[PDB]
Write an enzyme that holds these catalytic residues in place. Sequence first.
Site, PDB file in Angstrom:
ATOM      1  N   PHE A  62      33.878  23.059 -29.596  1.00  0.00           N
ATOM      2  CA  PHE A  62      33.683  23.392 -28.205  1.00  0.00           C
ATOM      3  C   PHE A  62      32.526  22.537 -27.731  1.00  0.00           C
ATOM      4  O   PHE A  62      31.474  22.513 -28.375  1.00  0.00           O
ATOM      5  CB  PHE A  62      33.380  24.878 -28.005  1.00  0.00           C
ATOM      6  CG  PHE A  62      33.169  25.222 -26.562  1.00  0.00           C
ATOM      7  CD1 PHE A  62      34.251  25.356 -25.707  1.00  0.00           C
ATOM      8  CD2 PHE A  62      31.904  25.303 -26.050  1.00  0.00           C
ATOM      9  CE1 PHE A  62      34.037  25.626 -24.331  1.00  0.00           C
ATOM     10  CE2 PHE A  62      31.686  25.570 -24.692  1.00  0.00           C
ATOM     11  CZ  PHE A  62      32.755  25.736 -23.840  1.00  0.00           C
ATOM     12  N   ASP A 122      26.439  17.767 -32.756  1.00  0.00           N
ATOM     13  CA  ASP A 122      26.326  18.537 -31.513  1.00  0.00           C
ATOM     14  C   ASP A 122      25.501  19.777 -31.823  1.00  0.00           C
ATOM     15  O   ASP A 122      25.999  20.758 -32.375  1.00  0.00           O
ATOM     16  CB  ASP A 122      27.701  18.909 -30.962  1.00  0.00           C
ATOM     17  CG  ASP A 122      27.615  19.724 -29.634  1.00  0.00           C
ATOM     18  OD1 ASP A 122      26.533  20.170 -29.226  1.00  0.00           O
ATOM     19  OD2 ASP A 122      28.649  19.940 -28.993  1.00  0.00           O
ATOM     20  N   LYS A 154      20.867  23.600 -23.679  1.00  0.00           N
ATOM     21  CA  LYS A 154      20.626  25.036 -23.639  1.00  0.00           C
ATOM     22  C   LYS A 154      19.178  25.432 -23.769  1.00  0.00           C
ATOM     23  O   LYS A 154      18.473  25.383 -22.741  1.00  0.00           O
ATOM     24  CB  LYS A 154      21.475  25.783 -24.687  1.00  0.00           C
ATOM     25  CG  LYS A 154      22.967  25.410 -24.457  1.00  0.00           C
ATOM     26  CD  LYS A 154      23.866  26.596 -24.846  1.00  0.00           C
ATOM     27  CE  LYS A 154      25.335  26.541 -24.363  1.00  0.00           C
ATOM     28  NZ  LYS A 154      25.373  26.878 -22.965  1.00  0.00           N
TER      29      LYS A 154
END
EC number: 2.6.1.13
Lengths: 401, 401
Positions: free
Chosen positions: B140, B226, B255
């Site tokens: 994702f 990632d 984030k």
Amino acid sequence: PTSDDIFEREYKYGAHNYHPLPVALERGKGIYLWDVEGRKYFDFLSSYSAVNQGHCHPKIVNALKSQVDKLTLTSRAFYNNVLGEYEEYITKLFNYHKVLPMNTGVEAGETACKLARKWGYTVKGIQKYKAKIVFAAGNFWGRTLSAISSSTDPTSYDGFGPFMPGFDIIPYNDLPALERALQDPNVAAFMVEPIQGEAGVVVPDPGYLMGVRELCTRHQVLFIADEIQTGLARTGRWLAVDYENVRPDIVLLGKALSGGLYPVSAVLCDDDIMLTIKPGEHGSYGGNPLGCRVAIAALEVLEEENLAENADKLGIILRNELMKLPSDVVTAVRGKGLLNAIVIKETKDWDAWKVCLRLRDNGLLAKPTHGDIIRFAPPLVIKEDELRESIEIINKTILSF
Amino acid sequence: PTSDDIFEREYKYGAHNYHPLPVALERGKGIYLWDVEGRKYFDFLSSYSAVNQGHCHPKIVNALKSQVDKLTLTSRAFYNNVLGEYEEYITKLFNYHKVLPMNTGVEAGETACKLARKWGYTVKGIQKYKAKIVFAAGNFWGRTLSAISSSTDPTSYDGFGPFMPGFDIIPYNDLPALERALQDPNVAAFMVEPIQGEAGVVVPDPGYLMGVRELCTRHQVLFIADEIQTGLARTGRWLAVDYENVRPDIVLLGKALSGGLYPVSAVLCDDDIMLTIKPGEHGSYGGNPLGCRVAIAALEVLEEENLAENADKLGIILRNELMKLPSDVVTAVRGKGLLNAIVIKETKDWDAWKVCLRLRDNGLLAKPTHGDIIRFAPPLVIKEDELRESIEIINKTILSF
């Protein structure tokens, strides 16, 4: 820490994906920027319309400071109390049923392409993965693999393929070309800027947007208007499409939607398009309460200070004055409201870069866009006397060569 | 304005792209969230690791409030004084030459794919537009057309094609499959999460990341890690890859890089990759001075409060305690640091959604990820006694069924 030191440090530790104009800014307020040496400049780019309201507008600053102590991010796994107030506000303001919140302009463009395709398949009845989207040559909507797949600028896509299929490109400002393209029943949408900003403030002819609306309706194609740069009073109306009284099927907003305080972008459209995306099928920081507080304030500034009417009046003055420059050196002046550009007769001695270096020397910041295009786009809070002082800087600079 | 009113207003005016857990939050501070009724909840999602530092960390808030009055956005047409300080800081912190700043995680992933392709063509010598990128099933990295083109989740890509070519998919946690895939000389990169977050906290086997590093080096392929969700102390180390002492070629951060106060993301890599992108060829709000001030503060909080070591210690306690739940109802417990998940034996009577509704009733907020997976991921500033109180809420809830 001098300007040269700032240049040098970024060169050492940052990617080389830009070559900015050599000026190092430390402070911004309204129409003005100050560099680390303390020199004062008119800002004639407005961060590509993200600071339409001026740098550090106190009402937008105050919304951010109030909300940052309460709650800044829950994610969309839960509800926050702000997002719905903002959705009601912006949808009622632009008269669409629904908004899908995102963060950057390119994310709004990506969302629009996804809506167009889902609507194409599930409503129009296009067979799966035959859907097409048509774009205009010179379009710019950001730098993801998809967005550069629709670009006609080789520097944006060369060396980054293979490319997204299903994107077709026609000339801008060309209704017969759009009509021809829309004979293909697998076209789901046409995406277009009402004025092309990064192409060099390319203003289409009167009636183009009306013809785009009619043709898209005639052929059951979604008209996506990209107002991420042109919207929010920059061109003298709430949306640049308002000059032709047309209602796009999807409107994209960004940049000025936050006054430059937060990356906020928006996809506006009615239920019949929006709800082709179901829960779990799209999203993102999108819709966080801090960005929503900022954007509410930023929109209220635009309405409460009547910035669209100010942009209309002063843009008339700006273009009239710029047209007094000699055609020997300035070959075109174009724009709407306070989104304007000049084209200079580039020799080998002089070019738009050198012009912008000298404007910088004389207290005004502008950036060149293609070697011969200079954009003139100050924040909409500028006053007439400030605008005339800035114009005289422009005249001094151009006539100094 | 009640919780039901908030639900209803968003339903009216916002896109239906989410179905959040029915709770309407108004305030966040540290590990706690409060809804509009004033009820208090443990936050066991941490906004998908964006609030590793806790909600509204005062040092990050103070950095934002100080910078918002000075300068928030010049765009990259000019230099601002902050970006270089931040670049020097973050590149020295993670020991890469250069950083390319962006805003959202998916923009960092897009930038990584663009770097991989440009490097493939211009350094590896792949013929133009034959370059491949390999991804792991269950990955994702966001929701653009490109990112859903690499997804194996049908809800993310179904009805949104046609898809980006050049993306190949192999099983996660499978070194022979990677070795097989890398026999193709047109592969430019492999992108992988060290732990797959949205797939349900899927932890690969010891040694997988070491084998990924070796195979990518052996075959002249870029290893893109990632860490947008796993990085920045969430798993008990600065990067989840540090558990295996491997150095990826490209590291993505996002984030928590802002403490949840601002969308900031980062692409880190050395000159030999970064500088395949030339001025004018990529960019974005990326690198704005407000987000850079926020991110400097957010990183300093992580180091100064020793949150990686706290996450390691408390994650051990969390997993040990959760494993005491009956295998009849909880079939697996997995995670590293404070990124954890449980799998429940879903019947038709009960499912992860009902569990999270009841946890909500009992003062703890968690979200289900696939109908049988619940993530347990509180902010890293949590203390041991708070963690044990939260665990007892979990036990009460699960054993109440």
